[PDB]
Amino acid sequence: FVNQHLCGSHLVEALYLVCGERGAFYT
Amino acid sequence: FVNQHLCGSHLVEALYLVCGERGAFYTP
Amino acid sequence: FVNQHLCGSHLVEALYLVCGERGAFYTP
Amino acid sequence: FVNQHLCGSHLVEALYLVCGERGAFYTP
Amino acid sequence: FVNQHLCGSHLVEALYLVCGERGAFYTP
Amino acid sequence: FVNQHLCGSHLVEALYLVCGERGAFYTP
Amino acid sequence: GIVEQCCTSICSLYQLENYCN
Amino acid sequence: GIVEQCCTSICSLYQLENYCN
Amino acid sequence: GIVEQCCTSICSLYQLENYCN
Amino acid sequence: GIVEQCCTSICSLYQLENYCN
Amino acid sequence: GIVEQCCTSICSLYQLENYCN
Amino acid sequence: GIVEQCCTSICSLYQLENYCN
Ligand SMILES: [Cl-]
Ligand SMILES: [Cl-]
Ligand SMILES: [Zn+2]
Ligand SMILES: [Zn+2]
């Protein structure tokens, strides 16, 4: 589903800002 | 380090696309 | 749905370009 | 400066997420 | 439609990365 | 070359907005 | 508002200019 | 998942941090 | 075009590369 | 300005919020 | 090209519009 | 790390894919 694909792009951008030095997992 | 900071933003965006359903682990 | 939220993200990017040195005010 | 320009674009994106319903002023 | 515009934004970003030195032609 | 890469990413986003229905030809 | 206006239908550059200082 | 939670309604910074390490 | 092909079902890297010069 | 602060060094969401309304 | 023209000094929308087909 | 490898020089798609799970 493209809508989840596009949302996920913004989610990883947000997590990049939020998690900072902690890092993250994403699938 | 903002040079690297902005690059990292683009890197995560690129990995998101490249990795597809595999996903990734990211930590600066 | 998060459509408004995702759109808003693109909107402020576009406004940043458009407004140039003028700058802008944005509130959702 | 283009590097300040690119940086500002990212700042606005970030501020959009951070500031949320409060909105923001931005000055290039 | 708005969703199409947003999708297009991401497609151009994706093609920028995938096409590399080859470049591209994008026409809505 | 990374700074030029990052710049190009923002340039194609800018052109996507500015060019509208005309579209664009991007050659590095 | 602006979400109302520009996330309902794509705004022209002129319409986006509305939000500039 | 984060998609089920944060793509169906807007996630706060607080909710988003639960997917950090 | 690419919007019709790629904005409902996700396009892979291979599929996107088809649109390169 | 936000540029001198956050384009030369990384600004956290907490440092960024200083520039909100 | 556009990269030479617009990656050290900021190009205006007018300048960028030069690269539309 | 990926920043050292890919912010000093442009990583190809294949180089980026090294950092997938
Ligand atoms: Cl989107
Ligand atoms: Cl950048
Ligand atoms: Zn988007
Ligand atoms: Zn950037």
DSSP symbols for H1-21: -HHHHHTTSPPPHHHHHTTB-
Residues 6+ apart with CB under 8 A from G18: none
Residue E24: both structure tokens together: 């591209």
Number of compact structural domains in chain E: 1
Neighbours of H18 (CB within 10 A): 10
- What is the DSSP secondary-structure string of chain G? -HHHHHTTSPPPHHHHHTTB-
Yes or no: say if F16 and K20 are a contact pair by the CB < 8 Å rule: no
Q: After which residues is chain A broken (C to N over 2.5 A)?
A: none
Nearest to I20 by CA among E21, J3, F24, H8: E21
Residue H13 contacts A, CB cutoff 8 Å = yes
Contacting partners of chain C (3+ CB pairs under 8 A): A, D, E, F, G, H, K
Tell me which residue in B4, B14, B22 faces L3 most closely, judged by beta carbons: B4
* Gyration radius of chain E over CA positions: 10
First to last CA, chain G: 16
Test mutation, E19, E21, E22, E26, chain F, max F CBs within 10 A: E26
Q: Given CA atoms B4, J12, G6, K18 in this order, what sign does their dihedral have?
A: negative
Residue C22: both structure tokens together: 């003028």
Residue with tokens 């602006």: G2
Residue D3 contacts J, CB cutoff 8 Å = yes
Nearest to E21 by CA among I21, F25, I11: I21
Distance (Å, rounded) from C-alpha F3 to C-alpha B10? 11
Range of the domain at E8: 1-28
Cβ neighbourhood burial of B26 (10 Å; 0-12, 13-18, 19+): buried
Contacts of B17 in chain I (CB under 8 A): 13
